[PDB]
Structure of cellulose 1,4-BETA-CELLOBIOSIDASE:
Amino acid sequence: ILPQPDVRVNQVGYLPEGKKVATVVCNSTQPVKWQLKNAAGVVVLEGYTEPKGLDKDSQDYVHWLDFSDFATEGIGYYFELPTVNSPTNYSHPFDIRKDIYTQMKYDALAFFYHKRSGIPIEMPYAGGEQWTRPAGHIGIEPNKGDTNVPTWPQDDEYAGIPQKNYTKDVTGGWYDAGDHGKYVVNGGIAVWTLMNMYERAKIRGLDNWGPYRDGGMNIPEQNNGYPDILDEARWEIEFFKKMQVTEKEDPSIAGMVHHKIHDFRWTALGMLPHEDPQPRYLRPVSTAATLNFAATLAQSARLWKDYDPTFAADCLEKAEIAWQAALKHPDIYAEYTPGSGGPGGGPYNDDYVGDEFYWAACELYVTTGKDEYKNYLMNSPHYLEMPAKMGANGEDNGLWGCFTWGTTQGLGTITLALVENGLPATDIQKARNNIAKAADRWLENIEEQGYRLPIKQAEDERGGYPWGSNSFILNQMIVMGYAYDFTGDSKYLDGMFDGISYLLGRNAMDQSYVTGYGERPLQNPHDRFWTPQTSKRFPAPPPGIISGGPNSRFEDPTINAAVKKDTPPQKCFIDHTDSWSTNEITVNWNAPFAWVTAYLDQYTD
């Protein structure tokens, strides 16, 4: 157990230019002297702290330490509080350099390669022999999928809506999280996010840079003439098209999309995808999945249109089919199912799809320019909307943030604000203004927080921090990036600097929530393969993977036993492999993590 330093910093470091604020846990009501020293112990800067009081989310008494003006590049800087009476009167060492995020952005995206179903994970792409593994779910005994996956047994207590009996080849796609399920909802926002960072880069003339170019990523498709990040996105998109119901399968719902596919029952940690012995089944279609599908294939179609016209035309054709089917079946919801004794995959339930309809309409209008989509989106209650705090999926009501896997209207709005389209110039300006307005609210949240994070406690019942609290911050930072793009006002960039600092160890746990980075790196994510705590035969996880973070709803036995019930929300976390409610890793959390790290590294250059 590494000591928690009084001076909490970004445990990797800072770009030379930008806001640099540490949070100091300190009982003194008055300012205290601080010193910044280089690796040789020489004082290079000094000042006094700014007493803030008792911080609500952490119940720590804190000061701020602002050293934003310091820009001298160096390795192994550290703070000391010479007059403070404590055994931890310092900070961890950190760097000031331009390449803080240069490798992290690639690590973030490599998560998706590691999570690929339907293909062996091999060197040199795996990045280490210990992360190598056989193909997952290509119908080879242990596995009962995914070449011939039947629809869910209609016998099952939580089977959901009636389905016809047929089978599908649904190989490929990504595993969603620490489990072996593949989900169209959640997969949707994740792949949308990878394609969006690419689209933004192309629009800003950066598609010749980083992961956006052919050969930009350490993947098998790295020399195929296509942008590597689109190759990775395409892996999920190919899976999505397999999930669409055909006329031959069920004429009554043809064009609708299966919500998810996974184990009949939940498996235990300490197993690789190829070892999974569970029967594999298709969950029923959902309107939300169908629309996730329509939105992303529509986006896919405009981005591939010149690289691979055939693939692109097929993406569009299938997307418009999905849209029309959704319109005839607007009320098929993925229902809640219990996590114990039930279907062996997350429910991703949502009983409202007005946002997905708007999102899909946005992507389809920008891709095709057709009136039907324009008319739909302009008459939506979400037209031009960018939430600063959500009111959408029930679970998101009163949650600080702009969008999630199930509250998706903001995704459509981003596309409208970014990509050239035929809406009235003033409407597009409104969307961009709404984005700045939301970002502004979050900048105020940062100033109201001891640990300078852009969320605040949920304004729902239970309050506190929600499951995957870190991903809300990440999605907020995407929109801050857009606010910076549209206004050129560097305060928005500084908001991202504050947010990433929180994620990289300037928090009430002194925890870097990213594997492979920081002095207290994330070591024990909930994952079936990368789980040394289950058995030391299994490997530590690859770097650049972000944990869901603090969740004060006490939603797994491990966190329940590890911390008291009155634990402050920002401390409701444990870096333990069995804590799924506090320490999982996912496609929809690593996707915005990749978005944000690539953005910061681009800013660095």
User: Anything to note?
Assistant: Residues 454 and 473 are 6 Å apart (CA to CA). The longest strand covers residues 60-66. Residues 425-447 form the longest helix (23 residues).
